[PDB]
Design a binder for this molecule. Structure first.
Ligand code: M7G
Ligand code: MG
Ligand code: MG
Ligand code: NA
Length: 209
């Protein structure tokens, strides 16, 4: 409902999802697009760089010293793990998840002279290599408040439904090339992901209300 706030917990995140009426236009506003394809599939992106590896890189401060929490190893991509251990090359490493992917809703920063819908259109364009267009926007607006339990940071974002012109196959035959997204896929192919429950909830709330 317009009232209800729902809090999900994962091993990595706590997220509050609350229906609101208007998005507070300002400096740091993220707008996320929950995309439904023409043939009715919910979309999800795999972030190009994991949150874990981004954090790790930002924590370095020396030419001759590289520093990494082992707990983060299970939350990184193959190429990232390779980059970390490429020089040391020990026999093997532990705590790896070969099925890891960083699931994210598409979308981005609201710019100064920009409406919400224009922002959604533009960001969906940039993150899909010009392959996503919006036929119709939903009317339900959600506020997402995320605490990252690993890094102790809180993030705010706002989500809307985007019914796009493309089909699932339209976005799943050619690989993504831009710097933000490494893959666009059906959320329903991600049932075992840590984020699947709350993401599925976001889609269901946006379409079944
Ligand atoms: C760095 N980072 C970004 N996000 C999410 O991604 C959204 C974008 O946050 P951003 O870092 O400002 O943009 P970017 O992802 O393009 O760099 C945030 O509102 C958060 O929802 C993040 N979410 C978690 N759980 N942990 C993180 O480290 C993290
Ligand atoms: Mg960032
Ligand atoms: Mg973007
Ligand atoms: Na080796």
């Amino acid at each position: 409902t317009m009232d209800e706030e729902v809090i999900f917990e994962t091993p990595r995140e706590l997220i509050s999802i609350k229906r609101i009426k208007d998005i507070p236009r300002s400096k740091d506003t993220h707008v996320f697009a929950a995309c439904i394809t023409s043939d009715g599939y919910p979309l999800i992106g795999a972030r190009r760089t994991s949150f874990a590896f981004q954090a790790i890189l930002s924590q370095q401060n020396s030419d001759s010293i590289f520093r990494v929490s082992t707990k983060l190893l299970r939350f990184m991509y193959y190429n990232e793990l390779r980059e970390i251990f490429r020089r040391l090359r020990k026999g093997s490493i532990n705590n790896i998840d070969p099925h890891f992917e960083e699931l994210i809703l598409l979308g981005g920063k609201l710019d100064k002279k920009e409406s919400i819908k224009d922002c959604l259109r533009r960001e969906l364009k940039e993150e899909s290599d010009e392959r996503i267009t919006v036929k119709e926007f939903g009317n339900v607006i959600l506020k997402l408040t995320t605490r990252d339990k690993l890094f102790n940071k809180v993030y705010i974002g706002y989500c809307m439904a985007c019914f796009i012109n493309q089909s699932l196959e339209d976005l799943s035959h050619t690989s993504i090339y831009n710097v933000e997204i490494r893959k666009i896929k059906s959320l329903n192919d991600c049932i075992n992901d840590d984020k699947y429950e709350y993401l599925s909830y976001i889609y269901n709330m946006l379409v079944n209300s």
